[PDB]
Write a sequence for this structure.
């Protein structure tokens, strides 16, 4: 289907056995989530946004259910003020912009 | 047009006769541009993202042209590291997410 943009485009994602709300964000290179536990190895990374830099944990090959897709992706975890779904995950599920 | 998300979705915009590259960003509530001069009244605003807050100037009713679509909308100006087109302008040009 389609999603208009009069409202913030939140979708529900299933990740780590939890249901979370996340913003579909074409301006984000990567998917960044608020503090949570995920299993497996991680490596520290710096993420920079409009207000400055934050430290995050990078988890690879995390399964995520999103918009009827069973996806697998890299996920960054840290002090973001909102869960964002970035182009890494948007491309995997075939999302595009159209006007 | 249609725009995939394997690369950052930059488009050329025209504002006040000036050509600029901006990111099409569904996570951004409102268009934010790097420091520039615009005419008319403004009011300060605070916007927040990854890494914290910034102060911007809000100009209302500014003409902006994007891929042949003309709009008159609110434009924020401040220390963003890149030009961002937000949902306020995406909606006015009929842009949607599709998958
Ligand atoms: C955090 C979002 C809810 C809001 N942001 C839009 C978002 O697309 C920014 C837009 C953005 C893009 C580049 C640089 C700064 C901000 N991208 C972002 O922070 O992504 C980071 C995660 O992936 C990495 O790839 C880009 C930076 C990292 S935002 O820049 O703070 C913002 C907030 C409000 C408005 N009106 C305009 C923009």
């Amino acid at each position: 289907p389609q999603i208009t943009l009069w409202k913030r485009p939140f979708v529900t994602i299933k990740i780590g056995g939890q249901l979370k709300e996340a913003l579909l964000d074409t301006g984000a290179d990567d998917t960044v989530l608020e503090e949570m536990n995920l299993p497996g190895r991680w490596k520290p990374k710096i993420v920079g946004g409009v207000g400055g830099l934050i430290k995050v944990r990078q988890y690879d090959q995390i399964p995520i259910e999103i918009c009827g897709h069973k996806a697998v992706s890299t996920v960054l975890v840290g002090p973001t003020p909102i869960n964002i779904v970035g182009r890494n995950l948007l491309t995997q599920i075939g999302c595009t912009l159209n006007f």
Summary: The first strand of chain A starts at residue 2 and ends at 3. The pocket of 017 is lined by residues A 23, 25, 27-30, 32, 47-50, 82, 84, 86; B 25, 27-30, 32, 47, 49-50, 81-82, 84, 86 (CB under 6 Å). Chain A touches chain B at residues 1-6, 8-9, 23-29, 32, 47-54, 67, 80-81, 84, 87, 90-91, 93-99 (CB under 8 Å). The radius of gyration of chain A is 13 Å.
